[PDB]
Each structure stands twice: as structure tokens, then as C-alpha cells.
Design a protein around this nucleic acid. Structure first.
Lengths: 1280, 52, 10
RNA sequence: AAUAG
């Protein structure tokens, strides 16, 4: 046990040993970006691949070319924290070495006249952080992986649902990574048609003719030949034995049945058959037959032989005739009938027809047609069947060559045609479109490489255009390359792509789940409305690869998936999952990662299979799965086993205790809502857990993990200094490690990110130990919510539907109080009238509102502010304003007139009260820094001095020097002092950060981990809540009616186990309080940890006295227990745990009504549930408006709480009002509340006068409609 | 003036590897920095009202 | 056969 | 696009 785990050991109720630990959860991001940016000597991945794909750039004439040498990434201007503060992208400069080689015209082509080698700046590449995130414009973002259709060839059918009859129509689609699409389809007349890029169909034979295939060659490729001879004045079939098995058969020695088995007579073996001429009459010729004497073609290819034709060849002396084999079951004339409907007879005609279908309305020339056909599929510039696409193509058509080819050829097209014809005949099957072997994962590295190659092509066009000019004596490579297109491409992808998403940052689990998210949408994917049922379904290949539970509930159902716990992407982008080998009947601890294609062959047992001490299966027939179908299989036929019991579910589903007792519809909700939990003031571990909490806490990156072991030299709320062990020093190293903690930093969802130390000075630490706990972490365990005392009973209708009744104590102990940090900005710009000024001289505002402001007009740090309070004072110059005559008279009476400037200041939003915790001032380079900005600059300089001095002192104390530290401090000073690159016209920016403490209140959303969500209805007094015989009231009362119809029984089991765990914790607390002997404490702890037949062997004898005391202290608030998914605690274990803690075995206590003192007539299930506070707070959702801003064109109220907008009275509301008959209410809604400009002012004045009458007019939207219809040249008018 | 500012900014971006600040562009253009800022903000096309 | 004025002009 | 009903 590690020290952090030794501090609080969680009891494990699992029974199956784990042979494979859960791998790093953020590998799918880090590995992809490493592939992108790392240098590849083989040049197959990333920037090197893109550069070698575009370069060398060759001029059209041949004068010169630009060649690629190498690339490197420079040093970032700012770090991640500095980029987030300033609002800039964290990135590295791309520097590429290129040589412009200029050839000699007089010399033969290829003579190196000159070379010019130089480094070129080719843009700025955004960098991935240590946790798999990007910082774009100061915002943390995650690029989501895509599940797309693999490149290659796919054979499909319409399933007999297009034509009037069944007639199942078959098609084959070739889809590349880049380039046009190729389609081969059957019509209901059994003819083969070709489509290029989804346009008008053409007969398939055309594509063969453009490839130089004669009609006879086509027939030879697509048909077998039955031959005929004239032997001794008799007709001659060449017999193929397999075909025969309506006429009299030859071979008089072995006569077969005549006009009425085959194998017995074929056993002897003859090569001679005699047949009627009528057998020839129906056949179709296979060759073109010419006569030298006549000079004409007696019979053409693909022509039906006739009697006169037979006579003509008889006179011509030809004795052998071959025709095509054609049947109705195994062989078909489809290619012959296609040739019949084909009007093309030569390569040029086919090229011309392809040009007409490509580019209609253009005069076809031979050269243009040839160039078009070459560019469509056989040009590497415009076609790319990628390596994955090539491998899938070759596997489909059974080709074992051209592994590195990226373009189609004759063999590929002909093999696709043959396979489609074969599928029509009956040999072969169509492809499963939703099979995970046909769907590929495309991650950040691939998409970045694609966009970077796009930028490279953009600049390559201009480079070729310039090199074609010729005047290159004074041209250097950096004068040829414009990096702005490449930068535009990369910023487009990283900031405006659909898959570049604003990071989910409510809790660590939200971040981990977001980084492990796979979308079917995005560029090159599906669309929400156009996606069908089949793609949204759970395929049998999702086992161990995609979680069947975690998926968004809504229009996105089935299109967004979560990676499973052990899922991985192979080198080709296909998901694979680990399995344990079964060798010689024993289950080996060797692991093989199998993909969907490889999985189908084998018989794979489940992790629940019983095992013997020798490693083999106990039962003779085991439950396994093969080809996606489950069943019972012999023990000797099992080839693989599942590595873990949580292999099929994702991390969020793996965090749900007793998941096997929950219906999947509710497990979906539980997994989704675990990601919306808001961290609280005090993180509390779950009493009932699954064991994956530590993994999420460590792999999220929110915690501070010891890079090296040692002894904690110094601990503080903001800094941890570790004295490293003597065995783990880099020779000549200071010997200390410094961990600076994040303290009250805003997250993407305006929550609080705070790191709290969990170590003491002098405490030994090993590698991987948790030194500080991030948000929603407790001693290295994920702590999303709080443990609540729960009673399942109705309480006077306050838990009606899904309502939740909460005790006042829960509010008093601040158990669900949350900190929300909000950022506000005041931007002083430059206007035509003048420059906006930030100052405390605010007109028409007294000294009451200026108390919290300083001389510079900015609020003090630590100022408690309420709604409407001024944070930053700002005055905007205003123009001359016309005064009404009454205002002129009022000014004449009282002469005051001070209206030079207008108060446009930053104020706290209404219903927001908090504390100012940070103020930042950004000033444009060349604008005077006010007193406050100078104060912040001095404070930052002093803090940098102090931090550098302390760090230097500790590192020199560990070691036991001026130029290097002076350089570091000079760099820090330059970063602090310099001006800020702000948006044009912006003179100054002041950002104020407000910390708001939000307490639980009616309207807040609370949930468990089983889909049991609800809204708080009442905050009950403690004396009114149900209580037990010992006087302890419950904390939350939940409705028992929500359990049976929703089939989430894991919540009841969790309640029972939580009651047991809290009882055992109370027993431990009692033993500590009475100061019993440590031997008794050890005996009790060992009894607790030995309960059940579990896989955990915790020996308290190996723990020191201080360790036992620490463990007992950490078990005071309840014993944490682990119940893994599908390997959980049985009911017998729960009852034994209840009996140990001296609690009823049924989990039901006798409760009394606090209002009356009377016992409830039945026992009530009382226990402890882990409850969460979701980020759906009534503070952010309560809106109201009477009158406000209006739209510019429609003159209707704006929309949104941010704009103080109004609710939309849609069509269905109008229908409801019409059904009621409320004509006057409807007219109010249409006219005087939305867009009757005169009517709404009159209505406001009437209400102020207390008259309550309206004078409706014409809505402005109708006037707009009239104007647009008139603008369409249509006279629309109103008649009286 | 706008086009030649763009050309000079592209050459300086190639030269130093980072975006040219307005004072450096002003020095290379032999024009005041205020004129550079004027040219900079008057060289932006109107945004569409249909932009999401 | 075509609607693009560019192609008609060419 | 994502999220809630």
C-alpha cells in the first residue's frame, strides 16, 4: 500500500483478482499529439508526412524547385498560465529548413546550378498541455475524437425496398481519404452502372473502355468460355465435368440421361460431347471472327449466334467457336447486357462521354478528357486511398500487393466489379456498415495533420506560380513562403471546428469523460437530423470498445459515445480491447489486444466464469460469446477471457456502485449527471464506492502528484517543498521539488479550482503519492458529492414526483455550499468624440457608491459588493443632446447643467453579492499607466522577487550562480512590465473577479449516481424531520415511489451499505473516544477488513502504531467500502456488515414524526446516500422582465437572460390561446407586448395612470413583411 | 497604403518570426504610428448579420 | 446543357 | 455545437 492509500484503506468487496490495471485514461489524446509533433525518421506520421507529401515543389518550366530538409519547433513566448492570463494561444513556432535549388538552362536538365538553404517561419502550432488540453485564446479546449467511415470499398444493398418488387439491388462504393467517390450499382434490369462523385449513371463497361479494354477482353475477364469444335463432321463440346452435375448425351459407351447421377458416369472420364445446333442458337459469341477473303466481320463479340451465322462460319472454314458461360443461378449475363446498352466503342468515345457527364455544356477535347480521367483516380495530387483505406480495400478484394499504393488501378476496379457480380450471383455477403471494423477513430493528430497539409497546398500553389516566373537571382526561400494561409488553417481547426469544444470543467470526471469522448458528427461525419436508427444502436462489436450506457439523452442519442475502460486504438485507428489467453485449458495472465475483426473468430469467456486453483474453468460448459452471439460452449473450445469486470463500461459508469441492479435507462442518467456535479467547500469521500475513484483523481491532473519520492521539507497552503531521496537524484541536482498550488482559480463553468495540501512536514512520500487534493478530491479519491442520511418515505407531499425534502442542518453545516468565481470586464475604448476614461469622477453618483473605489476608480481587493455597486468607474464622452422646452425651463429655474460625459460603468449584476478577489489591468502600449496598474505591477515584481529568492534559497540549501538567475529574473521583469497587445481601438481593460458563496435553496437540482434526480422543495426545520429512537434526525427524505417503476435498485443497496459503513465508523469513533487499548482497535479493524470472502488481504499486523492511529482517525466518519461493478457485494455481505455495526439486518428503522412525536406505522429504510449538487441552480435560471431592449429590425424584445430579454410566445402557445378563446390576451401578446411601438408606450403610460386599456395597432413585423414582398416586385397592399 | 502595409507586415513576419508590432511597421513605412493604427482599423470588412 | 455564365462565356 | 426539460 502507498502512503496515501495507507492513510485510508477502502474495504474491497470484490472477489476476482485483476491481472491488468486500468491504463492511463488520457492516452488517446497524448499519443495522437505525440504522433503529430514528434519527428518521424521514417516519415509516416505528422508534420514530416505532410512536408514529404507536399515537397518538393517543382516549377512548371523546370527552372528551379524548393526542397524540404527538416523542421523544428521553437520556444514558446508564454507559458500556459501566462497564456490564460493574457488571452493568447499556447503554441510553438514552426521553423522549416528549405533549399531553393536553381537549375541551369544551358546545361542538361537536372544540373544543380545553385542552392540556397534557409530557415522559414511556417506558422505557429498550438501545443497540448500535460493533461490533454489546448489553450486557444486563453480558453482551455478539448478536441474530440471522431468515429467515421473507414476508407476503402463497401458492398451494400437496398434490402429490396426501392423497386416495386423485391429485387434486392446491390451496390459497391469506393471511398478514399481524399478524392472522388466511385459507385457501381445494379439496376432492376441486371445491368451494371457507374457513378463518379454521385452524378448521372453511366454503363459500367465505359470505365473499362477508358482503361484500354476491348469488348472481347471484357468478356474474357468477366465470363468463362464454353468451347465447340467440328470433329469428324460432328459437333464438339469440350466437357467441363463440374458444369453438367434437355437433350440426348453422347459417349455411347457411357450414355447419360437423354432429355430427362452425373458423378458416377463422369467417373470414367471422356472429353467428347455431341450436341444439337439448337444448343448453339441461343448462345452469345465470345470473339470477333473475321474473314481475310471477304474482309468483313462474320460474327461480332457479344452477338447471339444464329443459324445463318453458323452456315457463314462453316463456309469460312472456321471449325472452333467459343461462347460465354451463362446460367440463372451461379453465373449471369450482367456484363453482356451492360455491353449491349453501352453506346461507346473506343477509348476516345468513352473519354468524351465521361467528360460530358463530368462537365456538361463544355466542348469536349481529347486532351481535356484525358487530363480529367487521369486526375480523377490515378493522380496522387487529387486522389489518396490512405494506408488504412488501402489495407481495407485489399482485404475486401483479396489483393496481396500494392500495399503502399494510394491510387486505384485496373486490377482494383476489375476486382471490385467481380466481387459485386459475385455477390449478385450468391457467393459473398454485404458489409455491416455499423461494424466497428468498418468504422475508424480519427483523433487530434490526424485532423491537425490534414489541416496543416491543406495550408501547405495553399502556399504550394503560390510558390509554383512565383518559381514559374524565372527571375530567382535574388530570391531566397523565405521570400517564397507566406505563413498566413497555414496559420489560418491551423487556427480555423483549433478554434472554429465543431470538434474543438469548450472544455467541460465542473469536476475531474467531467474533464476525463470529455477527453475520452467520440463523436460521429463533425467534418466528414453524420448530421443529427439525417442520422438514422441503425447508426444510433448498440452494435455487438461495441463490447469492450464503446460504452453501451454513457450516451447523451436527446437528439444526440447514439451519435456520441464514451471510450470503454480498457479500449485502445490500434495503429490504423480501429478500436481494440484486451483479452486473457487460455492456453492448455488454463487462463494465462498474458493479454492480447483484439480488434473487432479478430474478435469474431474466437470463443471468449466472461470474467464471471468460475475458476479452479490450477487456472482452468470449473464448469464443463461455460458462458461465452462467438461471432457476436452469446451461448454455452465447451470448456476446451474457449480461446480467450475478459480481463476485467468493468471492461464493457466507461469510467463514469464504472463509478456507479451496484450498477448491475440498475436499469440501463437510469444508469445512463447517473453516468451523465455525475459529470455535472459542482465541488463543495469540503470534499467528502463516498462511503460506498467502486474503486475507480483514485484512478480518476490521479489521471485527471487536478491533484499534485509527487514526481520523485523523499521527505516533505515544507508544507504551506500554497507551496509544497519535497527533499528528494538520495537514490533518485540526477547527478548535480539541487535535490528539491517545488509544487505551487492553484488557489481559487475560475473554471470554464465559473466554478472554483482550489488545491489543498494533504501532507505534513517531515512526512515521507513516494513517487505517485498525492501531495495536494484538487477540486472534488479527498486524499486522492474522487469526491463528487456528500454522504447524506436518507429516509425513503413520503412526507406531506413535499417529495411529490421527484421533489426532495432537505433538513435545515444541511444548510447550517454548509454541506452543499459552493464557490463560484465570475469574471467581469470594463473596456475603455477610443471613440470619435474622445477617449473613454476610467476614473472615480462619476456624474450624478454620490460618495456612498465611491467608498469601495480607489483614486484610479477601481474597486479594492477584498471589497464586499452587492448588486448595482460600481466596480470600475468609466465615463464616455457624449454629443450635443437636444433639450425639450420643459427641460430648458427647468434648467432656467435651477441652473445646474453638467452633462459633458455619460456614466457607462461596470456594475455588479443584479442579485449577485460577493467579494472581489482579483483585479487585473491591461494597458495598451503607449498609454499612461494609472496608479492602480502601477501598484499591481509593483506587487507582481515584489512577488516574483520573493518567489525567486525563496526557491533559490531552498535549492541552494539542498545543493549545499548569478548570471543565470539574473537572466531568469530579467525575463520575468520583461514579461511583467511590457505592454499588452489588445484589440484595435481598445485603450484599457480592467478585469474583476468575484467570489460568490451559493448555498442550497429550493429549486436546486440534486442527484445520486443511479439516475435519481430531483429538485429541492422545502428546507425543513430540524425539529420537524423524522428521527430515530436515539433522537437523530434524517438529513434528506426521498420518495419511495420513484424506485419501483424506474428499476434502479442499486440505490437501496447503497443505502443499506452506507448505513452499515457509518455504523462501523461510529463504532471506531466510540473505541477512540473511550481510549481503549490499541490491541482492541487492531482486532476490530482486522475483523472489519476480514468480512466476506474477498480478494483483499489487509493485515493490520504490518501497520505501525502511528499508522493504525491514522487509519482509525480517517475511519471516524464512516468506513469507505468498494463494490465493483458486476463484482459487487452480495446481500449476505451487506447483512453481515449491518450485524457487525449493531444495526437491523433489514436496513429499516423505526422513525418518529418530529411534529407530533408519533411513530410511523411501518419501519422506514434509513441509510446513507452519496448525493450531488448539479450545476442547474435556480439562481442562474430565475428571469423576469417587464420592459427592456428591443430588436433593431423586428422591434421585438431580445432573447436571453444576458440581454434581459423576454420569453417567446410560440405558435403552440397561440394555438392554446385560440383553443381557449382568449382573443384579448392573444392580441395583447401580439401587439402591445412585442412590436406595436406606439401601442406598447401607450400601454405603459396607461398602466402607470391605472387605466388598464390598450389601443392595438399594426405589428412592425407585418410592415417588414409587406416591404420585403414589395421588394420582390409584388404589389401587396391593404384595402379599406 | 493598406496593401503595402500588408506586404511589409508579411516580410517582417518572415524576417523576425513573430507578428510585427505597430511601431516597427511605422519605422519601416516611414510613417507615424498613429497613421499605422488608423490604417489598421479602417482595413476591416463588415461582418455578416447571419454569422452564428 | 449548362447554366453557368462562365462556361457560356468560354 | 453542447446542455436541461
Amino acid at each position: 500500500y502507498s502512503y496515501t492509500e495507507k492513510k485510508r484503506i477502502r474495504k474491497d468487496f470484490g472477489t476476482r483478482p485483476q491481472v491488468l490495471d486500468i491504463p492511463y485514461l488520457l492516452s488517446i489524446q497524448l499519443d495522437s499529439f505525440e504522433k503529430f509533433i514528434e519527428q518521424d525518421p521514417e516519415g509516416q506520421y505528422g508534420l514530416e508526412a505532410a512536408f514529404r507529401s507536399v515537397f518538393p515543389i517543382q516549377s512548371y518550366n523546370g527552372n528551379s524547385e524548393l526542397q524540404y530538409v527538416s523542421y523544428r519547433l521553437g520556444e514558446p513566448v508564454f507559458d500556459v498560465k501566462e497564456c490564460q492570463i493574457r488571452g493568447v494561444t499556447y503554441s510553438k513556432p514552426l521553423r522549416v529548413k528549405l533549399r531553393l535549388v536553381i537549375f541551369d538552362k544551358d546545361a542538361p536538365a537536372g544540373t544543380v546550378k545553385d542552392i540556397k538553404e534557409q530557415e522559414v517561419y511556417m506558422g505557429e502550432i498550438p501545443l497540448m498541455t500535460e493533461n490533454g488540453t489546448f489553450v486557444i485564446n486563453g480558453t482551455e479546449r478539448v478536441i474530440v475524437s471522431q468515429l467515421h467511415r473507414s476508407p476503402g470499398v463497401f458492398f451494400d444493398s437496398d434490402k429490396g425496398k426501392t423497386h416495386s418488387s423485391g429485387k434486392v439491388l446491390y451496390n459497391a462504393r469506393i471511398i478514399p481519404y481524399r478524392g472522388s467517390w466511385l459507385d457501381f450499382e445494379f439496376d432492376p434490369k441486371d445491368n451494371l452502372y457507374v457513378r463518379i462523385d454521385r452524378r448521372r449513371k453511366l454503363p459500367a463497361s465505359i470505365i473499362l473502355r477508358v482503361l484500354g479494354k476491348t469488348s472481347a477482353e471484357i468478356l474474357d475477364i468477366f465470363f468463362e468460355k464454353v468451347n465447340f469444335e467440328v470433329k469428324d463432321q460432328t459437333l464438339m463440346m469440350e466437357l467441363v465435368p463440374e458444369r453438367l452435375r434437355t437433350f440426348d448425351i453422347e459417349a455411347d459407351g457411357k450414355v447419360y440421361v437423354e432429355k430427362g447421377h452425373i458423378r458416377q458416369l463422369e467417373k470414367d472420364g471422356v472429353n467428347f460431347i455431341e450436341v444439337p445446333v439448337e444448343y448453339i442458337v441461343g448462345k452469345v459469341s465470345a470473339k470477333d471472327y473475321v474473314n481475310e477473303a471477304t474482309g468483313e466481320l462474320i460474327i461480332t463479340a457479344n452477338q447471339e449466334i444464329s443459324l445463318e451465322a453458323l452456315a457463314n462460319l462453316s463456309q469460312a472454314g472456321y471449325k472452333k467457336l467459343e461462347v460465354l458461360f451463362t446460367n440463372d443461378l451461379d453465373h449471369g449475363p450482367f456484363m453482356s447486357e451492360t455491353l449491349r446498352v453501352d453506346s461507346t466503342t473506343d477509348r476516345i468515345s468513352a473519354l468524351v462521354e465521361i467528360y460530358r457527364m463530368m462537365r456538361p455544356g463544355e466542348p469536349p477535347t481529347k486532351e481535356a478528357a484525358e487530363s480529367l480521367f487521369e486526375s480523377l483516380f490515378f493522380s496522387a495530387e487529387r486522389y489518396d486511398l490512405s494506408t488504412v483505406g488501402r489495407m481495407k480495400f485489399n482485404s475486401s478484394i483479396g489483393r496481396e500487393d500494392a500495399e503502399e499504393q494510394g491510387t486505384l488501378d485496373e486490377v482494383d476496379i476489375i476486382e471490385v466489379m467481380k466481387k459485386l457480380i459475385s455477390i449478385r450471383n450468391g457467393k459473398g455477403e454485404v458489409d455491416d456498415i455499423d461494424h466497428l471494423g468498418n468504422r475508424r477513430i480519427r483523433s487530434v493528430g490526424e485532423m491537425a495533420e490534414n489541416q496543416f497539409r491543406v495550408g501547405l497546398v495553399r502556399v504550394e500553389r503560390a510558390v509554383k506560380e512565383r518559381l514559374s516566373l524565372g527571375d530567382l537571382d535574388n530570391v531566397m526561400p523565405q521570400d517564397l513562403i507566406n505563413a498566413k494561409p497555414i496559420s489560418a488553417a491551423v487556427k480555423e481547426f483549433f478554434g472554429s471546428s465543431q470538434l474543438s469544444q469548450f472544455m467541460d470543467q465542473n469536476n475531474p470526471l467531467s474533464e476525463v469523460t470529455h477527453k475520452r469522448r467520440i463523436s460521429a458528427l463533425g467534418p466528414g461525419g453524420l448530421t443529427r437530423e439525417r442520422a438514422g436508427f441503425e447508426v444510433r444502436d448498440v452494435h455487438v462489436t461495441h463490447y469492450g470498445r464503446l460504452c453501451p450506457i454513457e450516451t447523451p439523452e436527446g437528439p444526440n442519442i447514439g451519435l456520441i459515445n464514451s471510450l470503454s475502460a480498457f479500449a485502445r486504438c490500434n495503429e490504423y485507428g480501429f478500436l481494440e480491447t484486451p483479452y486473457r489467453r487460455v492456453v492448455n485449458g488454463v487462463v494465462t495472465d498474458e493479454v492480447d489486444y483484439l480488434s473487432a475483426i479478430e474478435e469474431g473468430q474466437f470463443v471468449i469467456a466472461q470474467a464471471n466464469a468460475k475458476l479452479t486453483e490450477e487456472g482452468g474453468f470449473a464448469d464443463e460448459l461455460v458462458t461465452a460469446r462467438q461471432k457476436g452471439e452469446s451461448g454455452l460452449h465447451p470448456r476446451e473450445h474457449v480461446d480467450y477471457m475478459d480481463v476485467a469486470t468493468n471492461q464493457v463500461v466507461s469510467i463514469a459508469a464504472s463509478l456507479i456502485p451496484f450498477l448491475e441492479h440498475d436499469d440501463a435507462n437510469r444508469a445512463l442518467m447517473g453516468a451523465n449527471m455525475q459529470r455535472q456535479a459542482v465541488p463543495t467547500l469540503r470534499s467528502e469521500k463516498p462511503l460506498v464506492g467502486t474503486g475507480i475513484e483514485r484512478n480518476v483523481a490521479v489521471d485527471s491532473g487536478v491533484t499534485a502528484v509527487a514526481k520523485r519520492g523523499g521527505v516533505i521539507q515544507s508544507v504551506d497552503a500554497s507551496r509544497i517543498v519535497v527533499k528528494v531521496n538520495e537514490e533518485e537524484l540526477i547527478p548535480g541536482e539541487a535535490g528539491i521539488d517545488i509544487y505551487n498550488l492553484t488557489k481559487y482559480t475560475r473554471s470554464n463553468q465559473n466554478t472554483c479550482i482550489n488545491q489543498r495540501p494533504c501532507v505534513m512536514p517531515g512526512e515521507p512520500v513516494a513517487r505517485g503519492d498525492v501531495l495536494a487534493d484538487g477540486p472534488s478530491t479527498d486524499l486522492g479519491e474522487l469526491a463528487l458529492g456528500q454522504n447524506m442520511r436518507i429516509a425513503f418515505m413520503p412526507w406531506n407531499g413535499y417529495n411529490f414526483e421527484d421533489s426532495i425534502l432537505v433538513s435545515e442542518r444541511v444548510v447550517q453545516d454548509d454541506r452543499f455550499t459552493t464557490i463560484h468565481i465570475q469574471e467581469l470586464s470594463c473596456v475603455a475604448r477610443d471613440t470619435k468624440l474622445g477617449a473613454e476614461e476610467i476614473t472615480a469622477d462619476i456624474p450624478n453618483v454620490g460618495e456612498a457608491a465611491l467608498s469601495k473605489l480607489d483614486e484610479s476608480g477601481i474597486v479594492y481587493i477584498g471589497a464586499e459588493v452587492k448588486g448595482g455597486d460600481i466596480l470600475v468607474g468609466k465615463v464616455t464622452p457624449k454629443g450635443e443632446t437636444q433639450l425639450t422646452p420643459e427641460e430648458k425651463l427647468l434648467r432656467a429655474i435651477f441652473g445646474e447643467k453638467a452633462s459633458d460625459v455619460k456614466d457607462t460603468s461596470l456594475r455588479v449584476p443584479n442579485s449577485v453579492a460577493g467579494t472581489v478577489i482579483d483585479v487585473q489591468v491591461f494597458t495598451r502600449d503607449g498609454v499612461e499607466k494609472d496608479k492602480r496598474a502601477l501598484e499591481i505591477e509593483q506587487m507582481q515584481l515584489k512577488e516574483a522577487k520573493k518567489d525567486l529568492t525563496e526557491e533559490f534559497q531552498i535549492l541552494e540549501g539542498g545543493l549545499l550562480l548569478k548570471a543565470d538567475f539574473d537572466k531568469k529574473f530579467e525575463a520575468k521583469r520583461r514579461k511583467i512590465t511590457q505592454g499588452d497587445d489588445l484589440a484595435p481601438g481598445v485603450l484599457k481593460i480592467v478585469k474583476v473577479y468575484l467570489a460568490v458563496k451559493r448555498r442550497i435553496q429550493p429549486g436546486d437540482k440534486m442527484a445520486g449516481r443511479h439516475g435519481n434526480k430531483g429538485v429541492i422543495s422545502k428546507i425543513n426545520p430540524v425539529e420537524d424531520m423524522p428521527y430515530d429512537e436515539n433522537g437523530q434526525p434524517v438529513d434528506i427524505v426521498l420518495n419511495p415511489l420513484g424506485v419501483p417503476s424506474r428499476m434502479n435498485i442499486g440505490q437501496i443497496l447503497e443505502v443499506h451499505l452506507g448505513l452499515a459503513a457509518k455504523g462501523i465508523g461510529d463504532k471506531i469513533n466510540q473505541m477512540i473516544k473511550e481510549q481503549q487499548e490499541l490491541a482492541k482497535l487492531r482486532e476490530f479493524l482486522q475483523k472489519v477488513y476480514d468480512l466476506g470472502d474477498t480478494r483483499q488481504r489487509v493485515d493490520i499486523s504490518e501497520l505501525s502504531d502511528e499508522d493504525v492511529r491514522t487509519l482509525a482517525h480517517n475511519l471516524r466518519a464512516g468506513l469507505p467500502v468498494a463494490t465493483p461493478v458486476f463484482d459487487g457485494a452480495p446481500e449476505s455481505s451487506i447483512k453481515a456488515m449491518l450485524e457487525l455495526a449493531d444495526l437491523p439486518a433489514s436496513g429499516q428503522l423505526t422513525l418518529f414524526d418530529g411534529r407530533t412525536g408519533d411513530a410511523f406505522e411501518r419501519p422506514v429504510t434509513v441509510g446513507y446516500m452519496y448525493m450531488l449538487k448539479l450545476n442547474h441552480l435556480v439562481d442562474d435560471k430565475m428571469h423576469a422582465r417587464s420592459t427592456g431592449s428591443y430588436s433593431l429590425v423586428t422591434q421585438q424584445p431580445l432573447g436571453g437572460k444576458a440581454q434581459f430579454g423576454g420569453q417567446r410566445f410560440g405558435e403552440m402557445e397561440v394555438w392554446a390561446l385560440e383553443a381557449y378563446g382568449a382573443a384579448y390576451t392573444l392580441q395583447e401578446m401580439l401587439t402591445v407586448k412585442s412590436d406595436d411601438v406606439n401601442g406598447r408606450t401607450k400601454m405603459y403610460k396607461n398602466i402607470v395612470d391605472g387605466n388598464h386599456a390598450m389601443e392595438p395597432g399594426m405589428p412592425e413585423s407585418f410592415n417588414v413583411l409587406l416591404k420585403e414582398i414589395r421588394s420582390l416586385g409584388i404589389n401587396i397592399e391593404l384595402e379599406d | 497604403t493598406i496593401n503595402k502595409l500588408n506586404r511589409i507586415s508579411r516580410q517582417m513576419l518572415q524576417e523576425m518570426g513573430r507578428e510585427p508590432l505597430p511601431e516597427e511597421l511605422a519605422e519601416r513605412m516611414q510613417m507615424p504610428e498613429d497613421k499605422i493604427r488608423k490604417v489598421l482599423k479602417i482595413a476591416k470588412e463588415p461582418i455578416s448579420m447571419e454569422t452564428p | 446543357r449548362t447554366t453557368d455564365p462562365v462556361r457560356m462565356y468560354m
